[PDB]
Swiss-Prot record:
UniProt lineage: Eukaryota, Metazoa, Chordata, Craniata, Vertebrata
GO molecular function: DNA binding; enterobactin binding; fatty acid binding; metal ion binding; pyridoxal phosphate binding; toxic substance binding
Domain Albumin residue range list: 1-185, 186-378, 379-576
Residue(s) carrying Phosphothreonine: 83, 419, 421, 545
Biological process according to GO: cellular response to calcium ion starvation; cellular response to starvation; negative regulation of mitochondrial depolarization
Residue list for modification N6-methyllysine: 533
Post-translational changes noted in the entry: Phosphorylated by FAM20C in the extracellular medium.
Cystine connections: 53-62, 75-91, 90-101, 123-168, 167-176, 199-245, 244-252, 264-278, 277-288, 315-360, 359-368, 391-437, 436-447, 460-476, 475-486, 513-558, 557-566
Name this polypeptide is given: Albumin
Keywords noted in UniProt: Allergen, Calcium, Cleavage on pair of basic residues, Copper, Disulfide bond, Lipid-binding, Metal-binding, Methylation, Phosphoprotein, Repeat, Secreted, Signal, Zinc
Organism: Equus caballus
Expressed in which tissues: Plasma.
Entry-linked InterPro entries: ALB/AFP/VDB (IPR000264), Serum_albumin-like (IPR020858), Serum_albumin/AFP/Afamin (IPR021177), Serum_albumin_CS (IPR020857), Serum_albumin_N (IPR014760)
Length: 583
């Protein structure tokens, strides 16, 4: 078989730490609400069985697929029906039905307590049992991010470990640690969103979309890599993420390490950016490769016209070599467009395709498609200008205000979406501005739009469980490449029924005062979303004014000796008048 004992195989390939680590992740992700130590128990159990199997691969049940095994193990959890009404059902199922059911049950918004950099308790529990602590952390993250890129989560566990290692004996324990952990969780959220997108793309669009994505993306990254090489990496990487996305984390990690190895063996024909990565220890390397910056364009990028616009037998290649020719196009076009977002590239590929599909059905395809690259211009311009308008706004207005505009913007598009989601999305989209907008300008488009894809996908993912808007559905389930334009193209449904006004929603209390700023913002942005839901027609500018008024009022009442009296005295008036200020 593919390996006598997949479990042994993986155990042997990954080694215990990573294997347990990934099993922990795998398990945490599948069974998100389970006590950490029950996951540890299961991981141990499975790891134990790994070890037995590694010792005797012909042992009873060592033959079983990883999933049967892990599904089996998960299905043994105590409170299975209790904790996971859904999952129990899954457990009656054989693989892969069972895994599929299990994945489906994966909760993308388990809304678990926020992992708070709690330096003392954490440093303590890390100093007590760094293994349990990192485990916990894998668990905490995995369960919060049921699709987090397993291997990556082990890598992040290292950073998490490295953070605590650096910061625990420091006198300045909080201020060594909180920013690291803050950054880590951000890196986590982003990585998570990245992997979520990958996984969503598999789920929702299939491997070919993931592939085309990865082609576009790895072409950008590895522009000096030949197509074959990109393709190879894409196939492998797709497999990696397919596995990971399917909770086949061991395979995923193992394949990933294979891939990293492969990439590092081939770094010279892949990218000079890999050298840094390929010098790194395993997880770092893989991480580094995953996150690798795009290589310099090779100075021998081929003119694309010749093959892709001018070549007379394009239709022929298009007909008998579609995937490849398009893949090639995508590769070629993407490697020379690190300045475009992947989805843009994919849209461009789709237009390229559509244009061949058009041109080749016509009388002189060549005269039709010779202008094929020219049809990319509008595809380019739209996101470029959206990125500009957004960076401009962002620049002008700053993250929170930008988030607010985004919250308004998305709440308008999708007012049925839960406030927290809307806030989350607009918040994340604002973090996109902050991330992307400050980048060298040619990086903002790919940045914004790539990151936008992450956040939309987040919304989409959320929308999967909690479908509230067909328009979201449509945007989420139509072309992944079009998803961002689709969302961008959303505006307010002049159908949507303003959410009934509930004063309390905008009623602030002094509790807000003790909130960290991001939570006060969230509270404001939540009210803001709510202001929008209630007054969908209210312009962002009215909303901004009103939120302004709310913020001021909050700021003021928080600064009052009697915070609550302030909120109590002044809130309702503002709540009432706010409404006047809207639609």
């Amino acid at each position: 078989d593919t390996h006598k004992s997949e479990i042994a195989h993986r155990f042997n390939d990954l080694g215990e730490k990573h294997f347990k680590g990934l099993v922990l992740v795998a398990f945490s992700q599948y069974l998100q609400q389970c006590p950490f130590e029950d996951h540890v128990k299961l991981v141990n159990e499975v790891t134990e069985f790994a070890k037995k199997c590694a010792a005797d691969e012909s042992a009873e049940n060592c033959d079983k697929s990883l999933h049967t095994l892990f599904g089996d193990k998960l299905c043994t959890v105590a409170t299975l029906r209790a904790t996971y009404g859904e999952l129990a059902d899954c457990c009656e199922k054989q693989e892969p039905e069972r895994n599929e059911c299990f994945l489906t049950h994966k909760d993308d918004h388990p809304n678990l307590p926020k992992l708070k950099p709690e330096p003392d308790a954490q440093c303590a529990a890390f100093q007590e049992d760094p293994d349990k602590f990192l485990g916990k952390y894998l668990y905490e993250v995995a369960r919060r991010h049921p699709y987090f890129y397993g291997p990556e989560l082990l890598f992040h566990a290292e950073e998490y470990k490295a953070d605590f290692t650096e910061c625990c004996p420091a006198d300045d324990k909080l201020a060594c640690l909180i920013p690291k952990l803050d950054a880590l969780k951000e890196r986590i959220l982003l990585s998570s969103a990245k992997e979520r997108l990958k996984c969503s793309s598999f789920q929702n669009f299939g491997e070919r979309a993931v592939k085309a994505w990865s082609v576009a993306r790895l072409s950008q990254k590895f522009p000096k890599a030949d197509f074959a090489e990109v393709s190879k990496i894409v196939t492998d990487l797709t497999k990696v993420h397919k596995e990971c996305c399917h909770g086949d984390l061991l395979e995923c990690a193992d394949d990933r390490a294979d891939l990293a190895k492969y990439i590092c063996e081939h770094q010279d024909s892949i990218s000079g950016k890999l050298k840094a990565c390929c010098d790194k220890p395993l997880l770092q390397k893989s991480h580094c490769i995953a996150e690798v910056k795009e290589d310099d364009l090779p100075s021998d990028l081929p003119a694309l016209a010749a093959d892709f616009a001018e070549d007379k037998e394009i239709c022929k290649h298009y007909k008998d070599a579609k995937d490849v020719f398009l893949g090639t196009f995508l590769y070629e076009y993407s490697r020379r467009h690190p300045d475009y977002s992947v989805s843009l590239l994919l849209r461009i590929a789709k237009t390229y395709e559509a244009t061949l599909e058009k041109c080749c059905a016509e009388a002189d395809p060549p005269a039709c498609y010779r202008t094929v690259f020219d049809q990319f211009t509008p595809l380019v311009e739209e996101p470029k200008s959206l990125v500009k308008k957004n960076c401009d706004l962002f620049e002008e207005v700053g993250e929170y205000d930008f988030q607010n505009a985004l919250i308004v913007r998305y709440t308008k598009k999708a007012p049925q979406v839960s406030t927290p989601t809307l806030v989350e999305i607009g918040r994340t989209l604002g973090k996109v501005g902050s991330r992307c907008c400050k980048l060298p300008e040619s990086e903002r488009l790919p940045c914004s739009e790539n990151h936008l894809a992450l956040a939309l996908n987040r919304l989409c993912v959320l929308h999967e469980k909690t479908p509230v808007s067909e328009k979201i559905t449509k945007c989420c389930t139509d072309s992944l490449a079009e998803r961002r334009p689709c969302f961008s193209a959303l505006e307010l449904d002049e159908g949507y029924v303003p959410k009934e006004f509930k004063a309390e929603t905008f009623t602030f209390h002094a509790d807000i005062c003790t909130l960290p700023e991001d939570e006060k913002q969230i509270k404001k942005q939540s009210a803001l979303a709510e202001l929008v839901k209630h007054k969908p027609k209210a312009t962002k500018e009215q909303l901004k004014t009103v939120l302004g008024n709310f913020s001021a009022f909050v700021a003021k009442c928080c600064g009052r000796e009697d915070k609550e009296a302030c909120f109590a005295e002044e809130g309702p008036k503002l709540v009432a008048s706010s409404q006047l200020a809207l639609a």
